[PDB]
Amino acid sequence: SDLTVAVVLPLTNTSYPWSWARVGPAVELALARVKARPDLLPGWTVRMVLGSSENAAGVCSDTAAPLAAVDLKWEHSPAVFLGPGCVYSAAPVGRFTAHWRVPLLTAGAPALGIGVKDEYALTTRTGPSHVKLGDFVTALHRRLGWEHQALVLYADRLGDDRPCFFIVEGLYMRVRERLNITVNHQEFVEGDPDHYPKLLRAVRRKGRVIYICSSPDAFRNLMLLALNAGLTGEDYVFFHLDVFGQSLKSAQGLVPQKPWERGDGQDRSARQAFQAAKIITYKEPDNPEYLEFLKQLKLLADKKFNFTVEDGLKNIIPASFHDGLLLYVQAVTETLAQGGTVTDGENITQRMWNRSFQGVTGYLKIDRNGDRDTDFSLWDMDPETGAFRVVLNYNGTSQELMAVSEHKLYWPLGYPPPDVPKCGF
Ligand SMILES: *[C@@H]1O[C@H](CO)[C@@H](O[C@@H]2O[C@H](CO)[C@@H](O)[C@H](O)[C@H]2NC(C)=O)[C@H](O)[C@H]1NC(C)=O
Ligand SMILES: *[C@@H]1O[C@H](CO)[C@@H](O)[C@H](O)[C@H]1NC(C)=O
Ligand SMILES: [Br-]
């Protein structure tokens, strides 16, 4: 019989990490692996029905998505939902699926609010979530002895899925819960020169350990301004929250990363400014199955989905959809083996939560709350070359920070700055 999967993702817009053009080829690869394992889903064939989260304007919507989920639910009685990826689409869809007691799988929806599983029942997140970044910051602060204060600056585009707002919301709640520190925050608009005076005033008076969520250019600009104001690596550290690594190039091999470089006549000043800057990204999976996945994903997307998949950290999302689907397929199989059936959402979800699995993204742990443990990398500058590289990795499960390639964290004075200045703010 059929195990029907309902997909609510962006079907025509190709610009999201969870767009169908990237997730669809990944899902196909997953279903081919399943089809070649007869021990899986004994007497059940996975079929896919598709609905779009996009409004007329072509963006993922808080309206189009639940309307589509409702339609797919009536027409197909799906055993499970795949997606949505956008916070704004996921929020209403997840409340519906919870009410239907039908499992929803996603590698998007990183927002804090989705982690409230009393509301978002049977939602399993197999991609990153923003509280996990709070875990990473928590670890950093314990490693480096920062136990009092931090400042967060963040900005977003005109009005959308507000990635940076949700990143900060996630970071703030988790960090406050575990470290009891004071976390000042401050929103700004990127294209507005009126906002810079207040940003630089806030850096001066509100913190010394500083987190910035913004476009690569807004970060560079702020660093240049910080330098000109005599705010240097001795008293300050600036973390760029750039989870998908936009400020950095991919498939570089031995070509050194110089995120401070523009050829705009400020490169020397930028390099000098970036001595005080470190970059926080998701961890690039390093296992060989992943590189094979990327090879296969690229070929399939170009062939059947009319789309060129670029190298980048964004590709972890479709791979996590891939892995999530397989984790779900294993769970259903285990449920069938012990007398259950495919529509037993609660029993299927219990078998995914608090569990380890091996997939193209490597080792993956889903925590007790149904959210994947997320790994992070910290990049900083070789003072000799100006180049950036990964110097620390964070394992989301063990909560361990490990040195990478025997590198040392760069500090101008050889030790990190205190989070409170010796004379007060
Ligand atoms: C695909 O999605 C992107 C958004 O993720 C669309 O681009 C935004 O479009 C709105 C108007 O709808 C603008 O105000 C934003 O500033 C745009 N932002 C970005 C990031 O470009 C894009 O138009 C969509 N494309 C299609 C064909 O539907
Ligand atoms: C992360 O730590 C966990 C828990 O010890 C371990 O299972 C896993 O193998 C680690 N991840 C990697 C990629 O080493
Ligand atoms: Br979506």
Listed in order, the ranges of the chain carrying CATH 3.40.50.2300 are 1-127+285-372, 128-284+373-425
19 CA → ligand 3 middle, Å: 7
Q: What's the CA angle centered on 169, arms 163 and 170, to 5 degrees? A: 90
Q: Which atom of ligand 1 is nearest to the CA of 58?
A: 28
Handedness of CA 164, 167, 169, 171 (dihedral sign): negative
Residue 80, helix vs strand vs coil: strand
CA 51 vs. chain centroid, Å, equals 24
284 lines ligand 2 (CB under 6 A): no
* Nearest protein Cα to ligand 2, atom 8: 363
Q: Which ligand is nearest to the CA of 357?
A: 2
- Cα–Cα distance, 5 to 394 (Å, whole number): 34
Token pair of 307, please?
């789309």
**Residue whose token pair is 């994903």:** 297
Q: Quick one: which of 281, 282, 287 has its CA closest to 359?
A: 287
Most ligand 2 atoms within 8 A of CB, residue of 136, 395, 404 to mutate: 395
Q: Which ligand has its closest atom nearest to the C-alpha of 92? A: 3
Helical H runs in 9-79? 20-35, 64-76
The DSSP H or E segment spanning 301 is: helix 288-304
| Best CA proximity match to 154, nearest among 130, 181, 189, 128 | 189
Question: Whose C-alpha lies nearest to ligand 1, atom 7?
Answer: 59
Distance separating alpha carbons of residues 291 and 100, to the nearest angstrom:
38
C-beta of residue 19 within 8 angstroms of C-beta of residue 13? yes
The residue count of the chain comes to 425
Closest atom of ligand 1 relative to the 157 alpha carbon: 16
Give the sign of the dihedral formed by CA 282, CA 393, CA 179, CA 152: negative
- What spacing in Å lies between the alpha carbon of 6 and ligand 3's midpoint? 13
What DSSP assignment string belongs to 207-259? -SEEEEES-HHHHHHHHHHHHHTT--TTT-EEEEE-TT-TTS-SS-TTSPB-T
Strand order across the beta sheet in which 277-282 lies: 182-188, 149-155, 209-213, 237-241, 277-282, 376-381, 388-395, 400-403
State in Å: Cα 356 to ligand 2 middle.
10
Rounded Cα distance between 369 and 389, Å, is 33
- How many other C-beta atoms lie within 10 A of the C-beta of residue 92? 17
d(CA 71, CA 69): 5
Closest CA relative to residue 179, chosen from 142, 152, 143: 142
The experimental method behind these coordinates is X-ray
Alpha-carbon gap, residue 228 to 232, rounded angstroms:
9
Q: Which pair of structure tokens corresponds to residue 366? A: 């889903």
Ligand 1 binding pocket, CB closer than 6 Å = 13, 15, 57-59, 157-158
Please provide the CATH number assigned to the domain covering 128-284+373-425: 3.40.50.2300
CA-angle at 257, arms to 153 and 314, nearest 5°: 65
Q: How far apart are the first and last CA of the chain?
A: 67
Identify which of 292, 284, 278, 259 has the alpha carbon closest to the alpha carbon of residue 375. 284
Q: In 3D, which of 404, 322, 291 has the Cα closest to residue 33?
A: 322
Q: What residues pack around ion ligand 3 (CB closer than 5 A)?
A: 9, 53, 60, 84-86, 89
Distance between Cα 271 and ligand 2 center (Å): 35
| DSSP conformation class of 372 | B
Write down the CATH number for the domain with range 1-127+285-372.
3.40.50.2300
Pairing verdict, β 149-155 and 209-213: parallel
Query: Looking at ligand 1, which residue's alpha carbon is closest to its atom 19?
Result: 157
- For this entry, resolution in Å reads 2.5
Task: Give the SS3 label for residue 9.
Answer: strand
Distance between CA 64 and CA 292 in Å, rounded? 35
Six-digit token string for 279: 């970059």
Q: Are 284 and 379 in contact (CB under 8 A)?
A: no
The DSSP letter of residue 57 is T
Distance of CA 220 to the CA centre of its chain: 22
Ligand 2 contacts CB of residue 287 (under 6 A) = no
Which ligand does the CA of 91 lie closest to? 3
Which residue's CA is minimally distant from atom 15 of ligand 1? 158
How far is 180 from 319, CA to CA, in rounded Å? 35
Torsion from C-alpha of 407, 411, 412, 417, nearest 10 degrees: -170
Among protein residues, the one with the nearest Cα to ligand 2's atom 1 is 395
Unique residue bearing structure tokens 């997140």: 125
Using the CB atoms, write b or e for 296-331: b if 16+ within 10 Å. Answer: bbbebbeeebebebeebbbbbbbbbbbbbbbbbbbb
